[PDB]
Symmetry: C5
Subunit: 65 residues, 5 copies
């Protein structure tokens, strides 16, 4: 279940190529709650709606089972 | 309780229409406490008090 | 103490009149720790030192 | 002891700054508010006061220990 | 494992020499989770991506 949304998140973030997305990818790869929160807030504070949206989706999936 | 205040909260957020509000709506519809907190803090620090107020109201209704 | 410091906080925030203080006011009325913290941090980052201070007092007493 | 000494040292460094952020910092130190200490430390770091943020880090690390 | 990643993290952060890095190094040597988090978030909004990434690595090792 997780292995699909993780791939979706890493692909979407790597596509962006922004230095904020590059951090985001790492925050996804290690499943770091604090790093994921920081990356989401930064992508929101920089203008990346796609990155923030996919981070929210992957975090909502991760929070459960 | 949450299902009642949520409707007006999402209506206000869609009314805002800012790309930050669009995140906010997503944060509200998925019931993500941390995402709601981040969206509220960002909407407050950009000048949208209208969004922050309804996020605070809906979050307090979710808490209690 | 709580019944006094809450009133002092609402009084100071109503005095400030900024749109951030109102949120702060609401943050006090609903007793939301995270909202109080956010309001204090914002009032500190905008220059309202007294509002952030009284929010800190009301949070520590609570 | 360690905390009773470092509290005084921290307040001494912070009072010299006189900044409204230090004025918050002292209150964050005297009232022992972990969250306020974090906010004050990040703000002094984000404005350029390395001494205040550093001494707040020391006092937080000894207080947290 | 942790004592291994600490050296690389401290070296990378010391190389930056920025006042944020001086904080970052201090955050690592004292093993302060909150300080590491603040330093990483600040280094992201200041332009040091390598510092934020290595802080994330050391913190992920630090959690366990």
């Amino acid at each position: 279940e997780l292995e699909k949304v993780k791939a979706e998140a890493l692909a979407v973030l790597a596509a962006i190529g922004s230095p904020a997305a590059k951090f985001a990818v790492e925050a996804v790869e290690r499943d770091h709650f604090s790093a994921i929160e920081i990356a989401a807030r930064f992508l929101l504070e920089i203008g990346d709606e796609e990155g923030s949206r996919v981070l929210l989706e992957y975090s909502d999936v991760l929070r459960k089972h």
